[PDB]
Design a protein around this nucleic acid. Sequence first.
RNA 1: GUUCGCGAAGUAACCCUUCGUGGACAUUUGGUCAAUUUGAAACAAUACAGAGAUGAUCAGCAGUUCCCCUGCAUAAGGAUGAACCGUUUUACAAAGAGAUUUA
Length: 102
Amino acid sequence: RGGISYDQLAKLSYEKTLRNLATQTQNSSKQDKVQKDTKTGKITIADDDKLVNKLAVSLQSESKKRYEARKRQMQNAKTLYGVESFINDKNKQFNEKLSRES
RNA sequence: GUUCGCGAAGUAACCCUUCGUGGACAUUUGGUCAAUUUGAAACAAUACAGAGAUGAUCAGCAGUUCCCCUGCAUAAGGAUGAACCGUUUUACAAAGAGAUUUA
Ligand SMILES: [Mg+2]
Ligand SMILES: [Mg+2]
Ligand SMILES: [Mg+2]
Ligand SMILES: [Mg+2]
């Protein structure tokens, strides 16, 4: 049991997004360079604007999905426990935090 | 202007006066700045509030700050000098079920 370290958590997050990129290519397949300017020193990479848009969309979708999966957790945990005496929400979140200690 | 020469005129008798002409002496101040409104002090007054830890009443001492003010100050005081008192979501996974799809 126990917790998962950050180097093991990062690999599992990297393994998970590779399966999201695998099925994204499978759902697409189901439906149907390097230039180095010598004067400036800058390196320009030419890439597809669709794959850059799909990168920007999927990060926003994962940002909203974790935002909504946490918002429902806020609305559920506020309306679970009311037995022990509280005063405000920061007291409830602290007295619940004492319960996970024991 | 002074002084050292030189030349001419007059008085002289080689000295004085006069005006011509070479030298020498002395040689570069001040402003970062213009004299009332438009290149910048600040108080006071009026209005509106009105002193931290509190259940009430009383001492304070710090800290953080791209706020300082008094003071000789590395002392101390400025309400414990003031401001602080809010807003708060992703380093995120692993297991186990029902609806909607796909081709
Ligand atoms: Mg006091
Ligand atoms: Mg006092
Ligand atoms: Mg203080
Ligand atoms: Mg003080």
